[PDB]
Amino acid sequence: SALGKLQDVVNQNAQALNTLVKQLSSNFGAISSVLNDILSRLDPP
Amino acid sequence: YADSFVIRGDEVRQIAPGQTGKIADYNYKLPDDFTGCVIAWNSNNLDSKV
Numbered sequence: 187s188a189l190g191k192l193q194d195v196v197n198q199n200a201q202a203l204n205t206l207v208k209q210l211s212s213n214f215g216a217i218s219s220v221l222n223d224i225l226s227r228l229d230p231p
Numbered sequence: 232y233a234d235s236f237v238i239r240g241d242e243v244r245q246i247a248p249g250q251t252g253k254i255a256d257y258n259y260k261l262p263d264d265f266t267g268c269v270i271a272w273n274s275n276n277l278d279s280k281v
Contacts, residue, residue, distance in 0.1 A: 229249070231248070231249035231263060
């Protein structure tokens with residue numbers, strides 16, 4: 187009143203879970219990254 | 232299966248998978264994974280009359 191070995195595990199896991207959510211706003215080379223605007227501005231083919 | 236009909240000359244480009252226009256919209260629609268073949272030939276002398 188040290189415990190950095192316990193904080194590192196929590197930090198690495200939270201930081202790896204934040205990247206997975208941030209990867210959802212990327213187009214990866216499509217027009218946009220949101221599955222509706224791609225879908226309501228083009229026809230199926 | 233063999234389907235047969237008669238259209239204008241410049242409407243032959245709507246007989247294909249994934250098109251739009253008055254013919255492909257509501258006269259004759261081809262699915263999007265078509266498998267067959269499309270054949271077309273001019274017939275001015277048979278079908279057009281003065």
